[model samples]
Structure formats: structure tokens, C-alpha cells
Target: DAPEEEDHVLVLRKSNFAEALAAHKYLLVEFYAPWCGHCKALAPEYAKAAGKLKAEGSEIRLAKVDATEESDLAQQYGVRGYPTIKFFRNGDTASPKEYTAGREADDIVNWLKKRTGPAA
Candidate 1:
């Protein structure tokens, strides 16, 4: 049986990391490990947020990186936890703000609204 279609959440790797950052005007990236419980818990919420943003035609994009496989990329961002969420503005990799808000989908959407203003 085919699995249910999931929302778009960019799967970033070390190779395409820089390119993605450059492409998206405002990016919310999650650095997570596949085996982490917290990461797994956040998956659905993250997908929901991504789907909502896409539906609204928002420029902001959500993405994730497998920290286990992309250790070097994770280390570059000082990712020491299971799920490290960061906001990259204007493709600025030098300074990405760490997201310390709630994990719910609405919380994510509202936070992005504040950062990006009204959706287009």
C-alpha cells in the first residue's frame, strides 16, 4: 500500500545546504537525528507548519537535516541536541537565529508571521 502523501519539508544535506539557504528568502531549518524521540515528535508539527505556509503562499520555507548523517553541517551550527531549530534570514549562514518557541504548528506559523509579516 502507498503511504499517505506528506507535506513538503526540504531534506537538506551537507552538499545542498548552502544552495538551499541561498534559495529561500527566509528559511526555518531543523537539525535532527532520525532516532531521537523529540525529533520524531516534532516531525508532524513541522510538516503541518510547512503545509500551512505553502498553502498561504508564504515565502518562508521549512527544512530538515539528518544530523546523524550530516555531522559536519550540524557541528557548524553548534547543534548539540536532538532537534535544533534555526531561522536563516536573507540566506545568512553566518548568523542564524535559534528558535526557542513552542513546538506546535500554530506556534510556528505565528512566529513566522511576526518575523515575515503578513503572508502574500
Candidate 2:
């Protein structure tokens, strides 16, 4: 069975990445693997961060790419670990920060807030 969808987020595929990224600046895109228990555990926390970012009226978009669905994207993002968050602003790849490996939602959110800032 597939995973459930969440609000303020959309699952991504390698086929649609170029178009997807093109649509937003400062996008916080994640490369995750469903089979990875660590990634699953962090879902709720990530959702919370997504919600906050949205509520803050920030422009950073959240996108998720399942490594199991397209292993190539993992390689493209140079993902060496699960739950990796790659920050992209202005359609350009920014610092590919390693997200909270242990469900570090606050760290992810704070990093985004700092990187993107209030207006961003």
C-alpha cells in the first residue's frame, strides 16, 4: 500500500522535479525512503514544520521524493542518508542541509526560518 498524503505538501517524482522546483523558490525538498523506519518516524514532525512554514506565510515550499519510487533522485540530490532536506531558492540548489535524522523537526524549521528569513 502507498503512504497517506498530508496537507501543505506534495509527494514528488523525478519525472516532475524540474517543473515542480521551477514553480517555487526556497523549496525544502526531501528525499525519503518509506522502507526506512527513521524516515517514517519523522513524518509527523515534518508535517508540523510544514504547517508552521505555511502559517508563517513563508515562501519556502515543502516537497518530498520517495527514494523507493525513484532512486535516481536520491543520487541527483546526492542523498547519502534518509530524510535529507535540500534547500532550493530561486530555482537554484542551495545548501543541501541534512535534516533531523532523529525527528529533529525544530531544527529543520529553525534552519528554514533562518535561511529563508521572515520575508522569505
Candidate 3:
């Protein structure tokens, strides 16, 4: 059987990324390469974060864009390294803050929770 897909983590491509960004107020976009070891390691932790976010009905959405396949989107974000995390504020795609916190579920949640309000 094929591996089960994670529904919590939203996959962004060049096609839908712009619209998706515009739709969400707070978004965490992860630029990653499939071959990168660090990116691979971060997958599970990111999934955990996604799960918690959904369960809590968070306004902050979690998304990932594969750098290897979607280089345009990655370049648009000025992604310099694998597993580059950027937090988009107020649907402004042009000015995103890079997330430098440790790659842990709780750490990510705590960092994002501060940025996300009561979802208006």
C-alpha cells in the first residue's frame, strides 16, 4: 500500500501559492528540498505542528513548498537553504519573516501562537 498522505500539512505549488497566501492571514511556509537531510528530519515535527494547529482550529496555516520541484516559488521567497521557514503576516507575501526557532512542534506552535490572534 502507498504511504498515507498527511492532510494537515498543506502542499503549495507555484500555481496555487499566491491565492493560498492571499486567503490566509498567518501562514507558515516551509521551503524544502526532498533530498535534504535536514528537510527530511523536519517532516515529522512539521506534521505534528500541523496536527496540533488543525485540532486547535488555528488561524495560522502550515504549508510546504518543495524547492526541488517548485523552484520558482522557492526563489520567489528567496529561500537560500533547505528547510527554510518563513512566516507570512497579514497576507503580505512580499515581506515574510524568517523563522529561526528550533525545529520542535511546541517551539513552532509557541512562536506562531504569538503572531496569530483570535482569527478576527
Candidate 4:
């Protein structure tokens, strides 16, 4: 049999959300729209932030959920704009730092880290 694998990274969905929820460790989920112009701008920096977090001893997960497909989640989260980033801390939903389109990933990461991230 193939060797067992550890799920250090994953894509979250409405279905199997319990698994995502159970992962109470450090995590970040990006909610984006495929056709959003602003979302395109955020791609590279977002990737770098993920890499930086990983390098800093965190198993930071980068997940993308299509707003068009998951409208329920979008509405639930009050995503009034495209390319909104929803940051979660230990799977808590009480307060999530949300950002709009066109901000640099470094700025986003810095803001998120300063507020509710693990080191915060």
C-alpha cells in the first residue's frame, strides 16, 4: 500500500467542513472569485505570505473557495465585495479579519498577523 499521508494543506468545501473545522491549528482561507480583477492582483503576494508563514514554523494552509459556487458561504460571511480574505484563528468564527480587493499580500498578511493570528 502507499504510505499514509499527512494533511498539512487542504482545500475547504461546504461539505467536509467538519474536517476543516477540526483542524484547529493555524490556518488561513482565501475566498475569491475566479473572474475578479482584483483577486488576480493578490495572487502572487498571497502565495508568498503562505510561504512565509510556512517558513516561520506554521503549517499555514492556503485555501480558495469560489464565491460564485459557494454563494451560501459568501452570503453568510457578508462578502459584499470580490476577493475578500477571511482569516480564521484556531477555527473560531466569532471574529474574522476581512479584506477587500487590491491590497498587497504583505500588507494583508501583516494586518492579519497583527490582529488575530497565532502570534497575536
Candidate 5:
């Protein structure tokens, strides 16, 4: 089969989590449950941020994991909430920073920009 079209918010699983972290220098990962209302609310905003960043040729990438499906991975990451966002720099799993910014697209974009600097 031809490679599946990549989503703006990459759908990550335990199978490819490490590889993806290694590939992206700055990776923002969200651990969300499918049934969570908050996760549902954040989906569009998250997608918009990812799309905007992608269009601007940013090095930072956004991804999401279905916490319910990848419980082991979620637990490993200490995801205790429905949508726990973590900023992983240089694939450093030892100390991924928690994302404390707002959930809106602009909030996500601005905060990440501050962290990564202007998109290049």
C-alpha cells in the first residue's frame, strides 16, 4: 500500500514513539483519551497549530497518542490527565517538560514559538 497520508497531528503509538522522538528535534506530544470531552475540544485547535507550524516550515512537530489505546506508553510518560501535553527536546525522554500554555491554537503556536524561536 502507498504510504498513508500524514496527519497534521501525528497519531503516535508505542511502536513508533521512540523513532518519532528521535527524528524531531522539538516534538510536542499530547496524551489524550478518545472519550475525553476536553481532548475533543482541543483537537481542532491542536490541528490548526500543527498545520500553521508545518506551513511555516517549523522544526517543531506536534503529535498525539491515544492514551486509552497506549496505556503503557501513557503511564510511562506519567500522563495522569485526559490531555497531558509534553515538550520533548532532542528526544530527551528523561525530562520532557510539561506544556502549561492555553489550549487554543494561537496559544499553542505562540508558546511554542517562544520556546523554539521564530519558525525557520
Candidate 6:
């Protein structure tokens, strides 16, 4: 049988965001709105990247905060647009680097690998 793994992006909300961010050394959080077309288009690509990273045992974590549902958390992170991507490292919740990399799975995966200095 294939290995059963808990593999997928962590859905972050106001209550668990801080704890999750603090626990992971590197986190890639996407601030997205439900009704946003671009966000909808980007979802699967983001998921693919997350799954690939998780399957490979990469320490970098990926998550998404639904801005339409969790505006408080979105605002706290200064997310003014839908599908805003941020990279957090070393538990630094106050400042997360804006992700300017491409939205495709391969591109994002490469970006994460470059930032994290190779996969585990």
C-alpha cells in the first residue's frame, strides 16, 4: 500500500495563525478572497506546490487565509488585495516578505526552494 500522509496546505484563520506561524520555520501564506477570480484560478496551482513540498518532506509550510471570511487576520497582515502571497521565516510574524514570484506550481516551488536553501 502507498504511504498514508497528512499532506495538504494548512487553512489558517485568526485563532490558529499565530501558533502555526510560530511553529513553522518557513511559511508561505496566501491571503485570498472567495469571490476573487484570480484567487480561484490560483488555488489549484498553490495546492499542487504545497502537496509537492509536503511529499518531499520540505520544512517550508504553505497555508491560506480566506480574506472574505477572515478579514481581521487579513487586515492585521496588511493584505489589501486578493491572492496576496507572503513568506514568513524564523517566526517573524511582524514582517513577511511579499511573494513576487510566478503563480504557477513549478515556479512557486522553485521560488520556495531558492528561499529555503534546498529541500529536505
Per-residue error (Å), model 5, residue 72? 1.8
lDDT ranking, high to low = 5, 1, 6, 3, 2, 4
lDDT of 2 by residue, 52-119 (tens): 86566767667778888888778866677876666666555455454443455676677777776657
State the C-alpha lDDT per candidate.
0.74, 0.67, 0.72, 0.60, 0.75, 0.72
Q: Which regions of candidate 6 fall more than 4 Å away from where they truly are?
A: 1-7, 117-120
What is the lDDT, from 0 to 100, of the residue 14 in candidate 5?
Answer: 75
Q: Taking the tens digit of each residue's C-alpha lDDT, what string does model 6 give over 100-119?
A: 86557776787787876554
The residue pairs in collision within model 6 are none
Question: In model 2, where is the ten-residue run with the lowest total lDDT?
Answer: 93-102
lDDT of 1: 0.74
Write candidate 3's Cα lDDT for 33-81 as tens digits: 8788887665677778778766667677778877888799877656678
TM-score of each: 0.84, 0.74, 0.82, 0.68, 0.85, 0.82
Q: What's each prediction's clash count? A: 0, 1, 0, 0, 0, 0
* Candidate 1 residue lDDT tens string, 1-120: 221233667777776678678877887777778688887665677778778766668787777777888787888777778778888876787867877775678777777878767555
Ranking by TM-score: 5, 1, 6, 3, 2, 4
lDDT at 39, model 4? 69
lDDT of 4 by residue, 34-108 (tens): 687876686666666666666676555555567877666777777768666665666776775554434666775
- Candidate that beats the other on TM-score, 2 or 3, i.e. the better one: 3
| Residue 111, candidate 4: C-alpha displacement in angstroms | 2.8
Model 5: ten consecutive residues of lowest lDDT: 1-10
- Model 5 lDDT tens row, 1-120: 221223576767776678678877878888878788787676678778888865668787778878888787888766678768877786787877877875688878887888767555
Model 3 C-alpha RMSD to native: 4.1
lDDT winner between 2 and 3, please give it.
3
* Model 1 lDDT-worst window of ten: 1-10
Candidate 5 vs candidate 6: the lDDT winner is 5
Each candidate's root-mean-square deviation in Å? 4.1, 4.1, 4.1, 5.0, 2.5, 4.7
